[PDB]
Amino acid sequence: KNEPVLDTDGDELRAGEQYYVVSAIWGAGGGGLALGRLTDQKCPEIVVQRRSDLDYGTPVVFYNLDTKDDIVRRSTDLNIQFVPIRDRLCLTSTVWKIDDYDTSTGKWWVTTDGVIGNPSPQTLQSWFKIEKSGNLGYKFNFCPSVCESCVTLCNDIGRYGHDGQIRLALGENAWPFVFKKAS
Amino acid sequence: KNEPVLDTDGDELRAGEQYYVVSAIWGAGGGGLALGRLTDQKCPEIVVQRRSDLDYGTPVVFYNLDTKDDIVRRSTDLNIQFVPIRDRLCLTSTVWKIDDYDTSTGKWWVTTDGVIGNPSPQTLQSWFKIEKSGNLGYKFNFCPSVCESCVTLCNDIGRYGHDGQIRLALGENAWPFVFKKA
Amino acid sequence: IVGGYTCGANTVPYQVSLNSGYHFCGGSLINSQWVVSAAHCYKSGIQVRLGEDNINVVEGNEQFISASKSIVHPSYNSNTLNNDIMLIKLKSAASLNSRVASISLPTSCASAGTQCLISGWGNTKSSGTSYPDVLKCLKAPILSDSSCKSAYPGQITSNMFCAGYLEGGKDSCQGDSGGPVVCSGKLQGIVSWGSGCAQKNKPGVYTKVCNYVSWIKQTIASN
Amino acid sequence: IVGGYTCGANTVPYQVSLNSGYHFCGGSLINSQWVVSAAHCYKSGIQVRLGEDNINVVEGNEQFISASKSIVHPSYNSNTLNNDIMLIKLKSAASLNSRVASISLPTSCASAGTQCLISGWGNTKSSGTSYPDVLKCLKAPILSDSSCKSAYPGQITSNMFCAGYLEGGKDSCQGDSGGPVVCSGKLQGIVSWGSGCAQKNKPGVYTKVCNYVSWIKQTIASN
């Protein structure tokens, strides 16, 4: 019963429908999110941000916790899946999930090879929330409630440089995004 | 002067006419050549091969070294240019060219942004030969003769994987093609 | 299939087809939930049809079942011809009947000169294009490794065999890709590639299924 | 540029386009061999295009010069968007003429209310996207620090200024990044960032060039 997330046309976001996730800040704020990879790791793919505000990235689909509601709502746990158009380079999934702690950077990265559905301790890392970010748009928040007895990180997601690219990770300063209906 | 290259109807190839370049080997041998893009570089476009033997890709036209001859002949330097029907997203040319050496793969790729005409050291990278490939069809060869005093690579063109796609590069094992009227 | 004959309904109950348009391929049902086809037919979201004979007419004996898994042979690359085999797991088990049955994997490889049955909805013309409404069938002998290697110098691996006729006239063709080559009741081949269709000195080339039985059984077992 | 006009033929001869086989950012010619743009526009291999008619079409009158060096401001930070300025040295000097000319650097900062000329090939639509083939121009006033900081709480630094209309309808947009903001013949701003295109209370944000004249002159002198 939370308020819906809205796309840039003011329409409520629909579970299962394709949206570009584009920085709410253009220019120096970059473009959209996309499937990427690291220099030293082909699979799984990582979540990266396009540098150019002309480039909206890879479309995503959102999957609700309750398969019955078709509206994506604020502050409710969701799965997020990139829907690439290109060939599938990897056998891992394109579903977002939080990585294990990266000792080389001090970051908890957003990566892929997540899982869709089965809300449980087994899938805890695959559940994200979308929340209002000022009047600019929305932010992603990782704070899953799908396992009331599980200890979990509970943090906004920001953007940070890594490996010559722009990635997403848990952090104190959220990066704001908007959702655009895919083509 | 040299024997003409023939299309799949047995007609001689003509400069200025559009042809699909299609793998002489269907099925696992794939289909036609097309304009493509790397995931991390928008321009220039690259030469890729379609996996489906029913997808003939993007037509090319050939430009002869001597513009007085409209017959495309074997073992003769020529320019190759994709003629897209779609909307050109890049400002670079669709003319084929051997790229600079790619340290990340060890390959000399066929890419675009080549140049038509002016046989010379300046355009050396834009000149390709069509040669007979067994009895299956034809192969592309990069070994230009337009600059006798230039050091040049000299190799057949094969097909190889890059970026989850099928590309063309210099190599030892050529890939055979046939030319279908577009 | 070029130079073949109309199979008739029910006569190839292990024949299936996958996807459509530029992605259309044949395959073979090897048990109630698994299909073998060519790796070069791989696509995300594969749709399998079973019990079809006339593919452009609602017949009433056909099942449309989506793939839940598609396992390409791990040594396969789209830029090479070798190891052209893939396994497809159906979302639900196929109902077996007169029109839908599995074909047995081989226990040994077939010898040259063996007569095999090749089937598909591929092109039926050696020059020009015409796709059939019903499944076509072809009886052709496995060729000697020397004939195969001499027709395609440098490209025949130990995981491939040729079948057909050096004279041309009878051959598989585009659209037959992925379909079965059956010899003495065993799935020995998978329509993999060729040059032209039914031309002199250019026979069909087929994935040698007997070299993959261990990988097939293990892959089905652990999936 | 949203809510602007097509620029007069020669009226913005200091506008350049940064190119990697396609236009991705604007810039400003400050001397025959140097271009000012945004740090976030950096990429290796930049070709700079000057004197452009249709940016979607190569033509005569245009000069294509490869960047020989691209010097991002050393304090440029992707999280704070601060210090969003970059200098590009041209491999060869450019030919000045009626369509190619430099723009003066400021000697003092401009005050709120000053009218300025903002130009670029960016999006022209407040809803959706439309990229023009011709250079678009917009006259807009610099906004007060308070109006800028209240529109973008906690995000406006001493190296940034807002320009445009809080009512919306007129603004810089995607594609204009790196472009010039000229007030009384001085390059006072570089298109740096914004949120949405020409929306109420979301004006464009520009790098405050007057803060960087010393770094610019010292950079040019040592390169």
As a whole number of angstroms, the distance between CA C142 and CA C163 comes to 4
User: What are the residue ranges spanned by the domains of chain D?
Assistant: 1-12+103-210, 13-102+211-223
Residue in D176, D220, C101, D8 with CA at minimum distance from that of residue A27: D176
SS3 A125: helix
Active site residue D23: no
Residue identified by tokens 């652990």 is: C222
CA distance C212 to C107: 11
Cα dihedral A66/A67/A69/A75 (nearest 10): 40
Name which of A44, A23, A47, A37 is nearest A128 in CA terms.
Answer: A47
Whether C197 and C174 have beta carbons less than 8 Å apart is answered as: yes
User: Measured between alpha carbons, how far apart are the two ends of chain D, in Å?
Assistant: 33
* Contact present, D89 and A33 (Cβ < 8 Å): no
B19-181 is a CATH 3.40.718.10 domain: no
Which B-chain residues 31-50 have CB contacts (< 8 A) with chain A? 39
Question: How distant, in Å, are the alpha carbons of C176, D63, D136, D180 from that of D26?
Answer: 53, 15, 12, 8
| CATH number 2.40.10.10 given to C13-102+211-223 | yes
Residue D199 exposure: Cα atoms within 13 Å on the Cβ side? 16
Query: In the structure, do chain B and chain C come into contact, i.e. share 3 or more CB pairs under 8 Å?
Result: yes
- Cα distances from B44 to residues B47, C43, D69, in angstroms, run 10, 27, 21
Which letter, b or e, does each residue of A155-181 get, where b requires 16 or more Cβ atoms within 10 Å of its Cβ?
Answer: bbbbbbebeebbbbbbbeebbbbbbbe
Q: What's the CA angle centered on B117, arms B114 and B123, to 5 degrees? A: 50
CATH of domain D1-12+103-210: 2.40.10.10
Cα A84-A34-A92 angle, rounded to 5 deg: 55
**D57 appears as a binding residue in the annotation:** yes
Q: List the one residue out of B123, B129, B111 whose CA is nearest residue B174.
A: B129
Let me know if D53 is a catalytic residue.
no
B169 and B158 Cβ atoms separated by less than 8 Å: yes
Contacts of B43 in chain A (CB under 8 A): none
| B·D CB contacts under 8 A | 19
Contact present, C194 and C153 (Cβ < 8 Å): no
Resolution, given in Å to one decimal, reads 2.0
Contact present, C2 and C126 (Cβ < 8 Å) = yes
Helix (H) or strand (E) holding A43: strand A41-49
Apex CA B159: angle with CA B156 and CA B162, to 5°? 130
3-state SS of B137-181?
EEEEEECCCCCCCCCCCCEEEEEEEECCEEEEEEECCCCCEEEEE
The DSSP letter of residue A29 is: T
- Under 8 Å CB pairs connecting chains A and D tally to 63
- Closest alpha carbon within chain D to A25: D195
Q: Which residues does chain C have within 8 Å of residue B25's beta carbon, measured at their own beta carbons?
A: 81, 155, 193-195
How far does chain A reach from its first CA to its final CA, in angstroms?
29
For residue C39, the tally of other CB atoms under 10 A from its CB is: 25
CA closest to D121 among chain A residues: A54
Rounded distance between C-alpha atoms, residue D218 and residue D159, angstroms:
18
Measured distance CA(C83)–CA(D110) in Å, rounded: 69
Contact indicator for A134, D196 with CB cutoff of 8 Å: no
Taking the C-alpha atoms of residue C164 and residue C159, their distance in angstroms, rounded to an integer, is 17
Cis peptide before A44 (omega within 30 of 0): yes
Is A2 marked as binding a ligand?
yes
- State whether the Cα torsion C53-C54-C56-C61 is positive or negative: negative
Write the CB contacts of C105 (distance below 8 Å, at least 6 apart in sequence).
C30, C186, C187, C209, C213, C216, C217
CB A2 within 8 A of CB A74: yes
* Dihedral sign (CA B13, B19, B25, B29): positive
- Cα B143 to the center of its chain, rounded Å: 13
Q: Alpha-carbon distance A3 to C43, whole Å?
A: 38
| Among B residues 149-168, those touching chain A with beta carbons less than 8 Å apart | 163-165
Choose among D4, D171, D209, D201: nearest CA to D87: D209
**C40 catalytic, yes or no?**
yes
Q: Which two tokens stand for residue D144?
A: 């007060």
DSSP-assigned states of every residue in C190-215: EEEEESSSS-TT--EEEEEGGGGHHH
Q: Is D38 on the interface with A (CB under 8 A)?
A: yes
Between the alpha carbon of residue B112 and those of residues A98, B48, B109, the distances in Å are: 40, 11, 10
Q: Is D171 annotated as a binding residue?
A: yes
CA distance D132 to C156: 54
Q: Which two tokens stand for residue B126?
A: 């834009």
Backbone interruptions in chain B following residues (C to N > 2.5 Å) = none
User: What's the CA gap between D223 and D84, in Å, rounded?
Assistant: 20
- Could you give the CA distance from residue D119 to residue C150 in angstroms, rounded to a whole number? 67
Amino acid type, A62: F
Q: Could you tell me the two tokens for D10?
A: 């020669």
Say if C179 is an interface residue toward chain B (CB within 8 Å): no
Q: Where are the beta strands (DSSP E) in D5-150?
A: 5-6, 15-19, 23-31, 34-37, 47-50, 63-72, 86-90, 115-120, 136-141
List b or e across C186-195, with b for residues whose CB sees 16 or more CB atoms inside 10 angstroms.
bbbbbbbbbb
Residue C196's contacts (CB-CB under 8 Å, 6 or more residues apart) are B24, C126, C202
Q: Which CATH number fits domain A18-181: 1.20.1090.10, 2.80.10.50, 3.30.43.10, 3.40.50.2300?
A: 2.80.10.50
- Contact yes or no, D with B (3+ CB pairs under 8 Å): yes
From B4's Cα to the closest Cα of chain A, the distance in A is: 37
The pair of structure tokens assigned to C199 is: 């031309």
Nearest in space to C72 (alpha carbons), one of C43, C113, C112: C43
Q: Which amino acid is at D195?
A: S
Element (H, E) at A46: strand A41-49
Nearest chain B CA: its distance from D23 CA (Å): 9
Three-state SS letters, C21-56: HHHCEEEEEEECCEEEECHHHCCCCCEEEECCCCCC
